[model samples]
Target: GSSGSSGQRRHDMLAWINESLQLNLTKIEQLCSGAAYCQFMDMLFPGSIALKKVKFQAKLEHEYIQNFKILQAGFKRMGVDKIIPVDKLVKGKFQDNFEFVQWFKKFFDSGPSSG
Candidate 1:
């Protein structure tokens, strides 16, 4: 029987993200740190974020918060209507990050494909 599986959907989303962003992400929760999202936004809209402010190597909660701050600022600057759940996201939970990435993929897909 053909049944819907969220795990498969999640894997497809992750694979699409990695392919689109040219990233090597192995887990959806890795995006909870916010650096990858920042880069994702930058790729979507060039110069929308200050790449220097993003901490790709962030490990601590505080550092993760900082990365989210940068991502939020970029969103604000770009007039993006998405509200980031920084609190929930920083927890590095798979579900939260998975939903967020799903939304992000929709947004990414809606845009023009030209570089």
Candidate 2:
């Protein structure tokens, strides 16, 4: 059976992201815009993502799609094997966004140390 500690994990992950990015995220689903993710990638690997292209205030589905496309491009350039569930994420569902953030925390932790 699963450990059922996903709630705590999700909380910690969101907190970590908020602290690292100076964000005020209150819910995991708020990451659906993909704006924060693109910034995360850029922080990990500067110049790897086009930060200017990411819309932090994205709300519409198409705006969310654009943000995700930027994130996808960053992942592709970084050679990360993570497959972004763009459709699911754009729906702004808590579960889908939480799962992606969970994986991103792992990726961030295992990534290169910051200078």
Q: How far is candidate 2 from the true structure (C-alpha RMSD, Å)?
A: 5.4
What is the Å distance of residue 40 in model 1 from its true position? 1.8
The models' CA-based lDDT, in order, is 0.77, 0.80
Q: Tell me the spans in candidate 2 whose CA falls farther than 4 Å from its real position.
A: 1-9, 112-115
TM-score (all chains, Cα) for each model: 0.80, 0.85
TM-score of 1: 0.80
Candidate 2 versus the native: TM-score?
0.85
Candidate 1 off by > 4 Å: 1-7, 111-115
Tens-digit lDDT string for candidate 1 (76-102):
786678888878789886888888888
Q: Candidate 1: deviation at residue 32, Å?
A: 1.7
- For candidate 2, lDDT tens digit of each residue in 20-113? 7888777888888888888877887898888988998886988998899998998788777877887888988688888778887877788544
| Candidate No. with top lDDT | 2
